[PDB]
Every structure is written in structure tokens, then in C-alpha cells.
Scaffold this active site. Structure first.
Site, short mmCIF file in Angstrom:
data_model
loop_
_atom_site.label_atom_id
_atom_site.label_comp_id
_atom_site.label_asym_id
_atom_site.label_seq_id
_atom_site.Cartn_x
_atom_site.Cartn_y
_atom_site.Cartn_z
N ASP A 9 0.81 -1.12 0.12
CA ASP A 9 -0.01 -0.11 0.14
C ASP A 9 0.87 1.31 -0.04
O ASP A 9 1.70 1.65 0.88
CB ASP A 9 -0.93 -0.03 1.27
CG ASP A 9 -1.57 1.21 1.48
OD1 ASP A 9 -1.82 2.22 0.57
OD2 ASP A 9 -2.16 1.23 2.60
N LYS A 71 2.10 11.78 -3.59
CA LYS A 71 1.07 10.87 -4.27
C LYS A 71 0.01 12.08 -4.93
O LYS A 71 -0.68 11.72 -5.82
CB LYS A 71 0.45 10.07 -3.18
CG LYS A 71 -0.74 8.84 -4.05
CD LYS A 71 -1.01 7.81 -3.20
CE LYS A 71 -2.22 6.88 -3.43
NZ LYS A 71 -2.32 5.81 -2.56
N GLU A 176 -7.20 0.22 -4.71
CA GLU A 176 -7.26 0.00 -3.21
C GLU A 176 -8.50 -0.62 -2.54
O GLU A 176 -8.55 -1.34 -1.83
CB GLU A 176 -6.85 1.50 -2.65
CG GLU A 176 -5.53 2.00 -2.82
CD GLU A 176 -5.21 3.23 -2.44
OE1 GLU A 176 -5.84 4.30 -1.72
OE2 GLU A 176 -4.10 3.72 -2.95
N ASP A 199 -13.23 4.58 3.00
CA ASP A 199 -11.79 4.36 3.33
C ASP A 199 -11.30 6.06 3.71
O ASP A 199 -11.36 6.90 2.82
CB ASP A 199 -11.09 4.25 2.00
CG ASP A 199 -9.64 4.29 2.28
OD1 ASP A 199 -8.98 4.70 3.34
OD2 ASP A 199 -8.96 3.52 1.49
N1 7DD Z 1 -6.10 4.16 16.47
C1 7DD Z 1 -6.41 4.97 15.76
N2 7DD Z 1 -7.43 5.98 16.08
C2 7DD Z 1 -7.69 7.11 15.30
N3 7DD Z 1 -7.03 7.35 14.14
C3 7DD Z 1 -5.88 6.62 13.77
C4 7DD Z 1 -5.63 5.55 14.51
C5 7DD Z 1 -4.55 5.01 14.03
C6 7DD Z 1 -4.22 5.51 12.86
N4 7DD Z 1 -5.04 6.64 12.80
C7 7DD Z 1 -4.89 7.72 11.68
O1 7DD Z 1 -5.11 7.30 10.38
C8 7DD Z 1 -4.66 8.06 9.37
C9 7DD Z 1 -4.07 7.49 8.48
O2 7DD Z 1 -4.62 6.53 7.84
P1 7DD Z 1 -4.01 5.48 6.63
O3 7DD Z 1 -5.17 4.87 6.13
O4 7DD Z 1 -2.82 4.75 7.40
O5 7DD Z 1 -3.32 6.54 5.70
P2 7DD Z 1 -3.26 6.79 4.31
O6 7DD Z 1 -3.53 5.62 3.29
O7 7DD Z 1 -2.18 7.49 3.86
O8 7DD Z 1 -4.75 7.57 4.03
C10 7DD Z 1 -3.72 9.37 10.34
O9 7DD Z 1 -4.30 10.59 10.52
C11 7DD Z 1 -3.48 8.32 11.80
O10 7DD Z 1 -3.57 9.38 12.77
MG MG Z 2 -5.04 4.77 2.18
#
Ligand code: 7DD
Ligand code: MG
Length: 382
Positions: A9, A71, A176, A199
Site C-alpha cells: 500500500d 501521491k 485500493e 476509506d
Molecule cells: N487508532 C487510531 N485512532 C484514530 N486514528 C488513527 C488510529 C491509527 C491511525 N489513525 C489515523 O489514520 C490516519 C492514517 O490513515 P491511513 O489509512 O493509514 O493513511 P493513508 O492511506 O495515507 O490515508 C492518520 O491520520 C492516523 O492518525
Molecule cells: Mg490509504
């Protein structure tokens, strides 16, 4: 000999890598112990390139020399209206070169470098490759890489090209939301089903309506918001504490980028903690002007600060339904993807939107894209 093919990913804000080993997908932790890696580049004063957590975590007064969100630029021309809008919000210099938006940064010792978006993405891929290689105890040459479903021909090709720069043969590019569905084994089911993939990530929000029939996915419609995600929820919390600190001390902390950076790191950590507990402490020694910072955040207050943004995520869902000629009850599967779907309130609002229907469960939402890629990589590894 493709060896052990990895599933990657390659994310806007966070990336993830997995492999199929001993009969199951293994999501691989990086050298800082994290199962996701920020899509982030930076430089030391000595001119050493940092990638991932080390880059994002490096304290700096010079955000212009960090690179992230590549990206948003990959596979696009310089004069693309999307690029010209996005560069307004990026702290680093973007310049027209060979029709494209190259990134220009100072890296140390007064040296200047210019990088194509695919070269930045190649750095991130190299980091994901090294992560896998440390885990497997051998070199990796081939990968399955995921892209958003809305990615066009040039964006897909530029992602493959980033692979190539990283020394990866990108054998397959897969969408995705499709990869997420594969992670949940929704492709291995009979009959004709409608799948809503929700997502909500770090910087982006994507909603996809997929149909599955006879092992073949079709992306019927997509929607979302290109600038909504967990970063926005963090900023609402930042605003809240920045205001409270000013009200206590009379000082505005935004004058110091390092202070803002420290606070952002702790806020994001507290946010994550609040997905599994009801209160979190935020503490920072030598926060601003040699004064320490110590405050608490409750889950209720986090929710109150972001409730409008949480509720705004339903509008793109209603739009993809209308565009697919479907009603809520036509949805057979709901798949939650992205780190911000760990937020209890988000889970709750999605379930209420669908009148009490439970979503798919069992795979970490920030891992589900890599997981699916890894499933396919397993088959290709033999
Ligand atoms: N346990 C949690 N509770 C709330 N939010 C969480 C988590 C763990 C990660 N995050 C928040 O998720 C966001 C990143 O999401 P992602 O899908 O990993 O990143 P992307 O594919 O770049 O959009 C980031 O904003 C990261 O802070
Ligand atoms: Mg993502």
C-alpha cells in the site's frame, strides 16, 4: 524467478507492506516497530536522506525542505488544475520541469535537489522494500502495488515507474478498495454483490461502490473528499489546545514551528489512544519558552471538536449510491478502510447510516489495502 513477492500500500500519508508466508499474510513492522510508515522524506544538516518515521519525526524550523503528499502530484502534469491548487498548500517548492511538477528542496550544505514525484515515491517504496527485506532475511525484487480506484493511465504508469526506480518490478497494480475487499475474502463468494468501501485515511477520504460477480470486481462509482482525513481531526484538536494555552499564558505558540510540531505529534498519539480509552494525557517538556505543557483530552471532547467533519463523510456515501442507482438496502457488504475508521464515532455513524448493518471486521483498517495486495502476491510467489 520472482522470489517472494511483496504487497505494498503506497499511501498518500502512510504506507504498509505485507507478505504471504507460512499460509497467511504477515504485515511487516518497520525498523521503528511500526506496521505503517509515513510517506515522508527529510534531510539532516549533514545531507543524509531520512525516510519514514525518522523524516516525519525530525524536528525542524524548515518544513520547506521536507517532502510529503507526493501521491497528490504523481502522474500529473505541472499545469494540471489539481496540481496548481495543491501546491498552494504544500510548504516545499514545486517547479515545472519536463512538463511535470518536480519537487525542489535544500538537503544540506547549501545543496539543492530537484525530484520528480515518482522519485519521491520511489524513496518510499525503497523504504517499504527494505522493511520487507529485513523481515524475510533476503532481497525482494517484485511487488504488487495498490493505487486509488480513480487513478488514470499516467498515474498508474508513474507508480510502476517509481517501483522501477526503487528496484522493484511492479507486477500488478490493483485498486485500493478492491484490495481491501480481497483482504476480507469477498472475491471468494458466490452470486452478485454490492460492496461499499468507506476509506477514511490521513489526508484523503475515498468512498467506492464495487460489484463482485464470479471473482471479478467492477468499480461502479467513486467519490469522497481529497482533503479530509485524520490530519484534519488532529488540527481541530491543535486549534483547541493552542487557544487554551493562549488563554492561560497570553502566548501564541505558532511562532515556534518546533513547538507546533511537538504538539502535533502528541495530539496524534492522544487521538489514537482515544480510539481505545476515554481519556488521554498530552505532555511536553520544554514546550514553549521553557514552560512545560500538560493537558488531558476526553473522547467526548475529541468527538465534539470534530462532529461536523465526521458527519460530512456521509454526503459522499449518499452520492456514490445515487450514482450507482442503488439504495442503502442494496448494499450487501460494508468495508471500513483507513486509520481514521478506528475512531468509534466514525464506526457508529457509518453503521447508523446503514440502519444498523455491521461492517466487515477483523483486519486492521490501515493494513487492509496492503493485506489484499499481499494475498495476491502470495499467489504470484507460488
Ligand atoms: N487508532 C487510531 N485512532 C484514530 N486514528 C488513527 C488510529 C491509527 C491511525 N489513525 C489515523 O489514520 C490516519 C492514517 O490513515 P491511513 O489509512 O493509514 O493513511 P493513508 O492511506 O495515507 O490515508 C492518520 O491520520 C492516523 O492518525
Ligand atoms: Mg490509504
Amino acid at each position: 524467478d520472482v522470489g517472494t513477492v511483496v504487497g505494498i500500500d503506497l499511501g498518500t500519508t502512510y504506507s504498509c507492506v505485507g507478505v504471504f508466508k507460512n499460509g497467511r499474510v504477515e504485515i511487516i513492522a518497520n525498523d521503528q516497530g511500526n506496521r505503517i510508515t509515513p510517506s515522508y522524506v527529510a534531510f539532516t544538516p549533514e545531507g543524509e536522506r531520512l525516510i519514514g518515521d525518522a523524516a516525519k519525526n525530525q524536528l525542524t524550523s524548515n518544513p520547506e525542505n521536507t517532502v510529503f503528499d507526493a501521491k497528490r502530484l504523481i502522474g500529473r502534469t505541472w499545469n494540471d488544475p489539481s496540481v496548481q491548487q495543491d501546491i498552494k498548500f504544500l510548504p516545499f517548492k514545486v517547479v515545472e520541469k519536463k512538463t511535470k511538477p518536480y519537487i525542489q528542496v535544500d538537503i544540506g550544505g547549501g545543496q539543492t535537489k530537484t525530484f520528480a514525484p515518482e522519485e519521491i515515491s520511489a524513496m518510499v517504496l525503497t523504504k517499504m522494500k527494505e522493511t520487507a527485506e529485513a523481515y524475510l532475511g533476503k532481497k525482494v525484487t517484485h511487488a504488487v502495488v495498490t493505487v486509488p480506484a480513480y487513478f488514470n493511465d499516467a498515474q498508474r504508469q508513474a507508480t510502476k515507474d517509481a517501483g522501477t526506480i526503487a528496484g522493484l518490478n511492479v507486477m500488478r497494480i490493483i485498486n485500493e478498495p478492491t484490495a481491501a475487499a480481497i483482504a476480507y475474502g469477498l472475491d471468494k463468494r458466490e452470486g452478485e454483490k454490492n460492496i461499499l468501501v468507506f476509506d477514511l485515511g490521513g489526508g484523503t477520504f475515498d468512498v467506492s461502490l464495487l460489484t463482485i460477480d464470479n471473482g471479478v470486481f467492477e468499480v461502479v462509482a467513486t467519490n469522497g473528499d481529497t482533503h479530509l482525513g485524520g490530519e484534519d481531526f488532529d488540527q481541530r484538536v491543535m486549534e483547541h489546545f493552542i487557544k487554551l494555552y493562549k488563554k492561560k499564558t497570553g502566548k501564541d505558540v505558532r511562532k515556534d514551528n518546533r513547538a507546533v510540531q511537538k504538539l502535533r505529534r502528541e495530539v496524534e498519539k492522544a487521538k489514537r489512544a482515544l480510539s481505545s480509552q476515554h481519556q488521554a494525557r498530552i505532555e511536553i517538556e520544554s514546550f514553549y519558552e521553557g514552560e512545560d505543557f500538560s493537558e488531558t483530552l476526553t473522547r467526548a471532547k475529541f468527538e465534539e471538536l470534530n462532529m461536523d467533519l465526521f458527519r460530512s463523510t456521509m454526503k459522499p456515501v449518499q452520492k456514490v449510491l445515487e450514482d450507482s442507482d442503488l439504495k442503502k438496502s442494496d448494499i450487501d457488504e460494508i468495508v471500513l478502510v483507513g486509520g481514521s475508521t478506528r475512531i468509534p464515532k466514525i464506526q457508529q455513524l457509518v453503521k447508523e447510516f446503514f440502519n444498523g448493518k455491521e461492517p466487515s471486521r477483523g483486519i486492521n483498517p490501515d493494513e487492509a489495502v496492503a493485506y489484499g495486495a499481499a494475498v495476491q502476491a502470495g499467489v504470484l510467489s507460488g
